[PDB]
Structure 1
Amino acid sequence: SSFSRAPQQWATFARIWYLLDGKMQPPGKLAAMASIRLQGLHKPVYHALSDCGDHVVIM
C-alpha cells in the first residue's frame, strides 16, 4: 500500500522466476506445477487476458 500507481501496477503484474528440481520427480506432476505457474493460475489477480504468466526453470 501507499505505492504510486505505476510502481504498484508493476509490482502486482511482475513475473516471478520459479525453480523446479526434476530429479526423481514424475514429469506429470512437474508439468502440472509448471503449467499452473506459466498460466499464472497461482496468482489471485489471474486472468486469461492479463498475460500474468511467470517463468519456470526446471532442472
Structure 2
Amino acid sequence: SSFSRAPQQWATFARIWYLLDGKMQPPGKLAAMASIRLQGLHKPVYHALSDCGDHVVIM
C-alpha cells in the first residue's frame, strides 16, 4: 500500500460505524449479526486482545 507505519496501523485498526434496521426483523438475527460486528469477528485481523470492535447503530 506504501503507507507510512502509523497511518497504516491506524487504517487497519480503526473503527467502523455500521447501521442496522429493525422494522419487522427478528431480534435474534439482529443480535447475531450485531454481536459479530461488536466483537469484531468480521475482520480477518481479529484477536480477542486487539480491541477490534466496531460501533453498531440499531434503529
TM-score by length of 2: 0.99
State how many pairs are aligned.
59
For residues 22 and 47 of structure 1, the distance between their equivalents in structure 2, rounded to whole angstroms, comes to: 29
Q: How many angstroms does 1:21 deviate by?
A: 0.3
Structure 1: state its 5+ residue gaps. none
For residues 51 and 22 of structure 2, the distance between their equivalents in structure 1, rounded to whole angstroms, comes to: 26
| Identical residues among aligned pairs (%) | 100
For residues 23 and 9 of structure 1, the distance between their equivalents in structure 2, rounded to whole angstroms, comes to: 37
Q: How many angstroms does 1:9 deviate by?
A: 0.2
TM-score by length of 1: 0.99
Q: How many angstroms does 1:4 deviate by?
A: 0.2
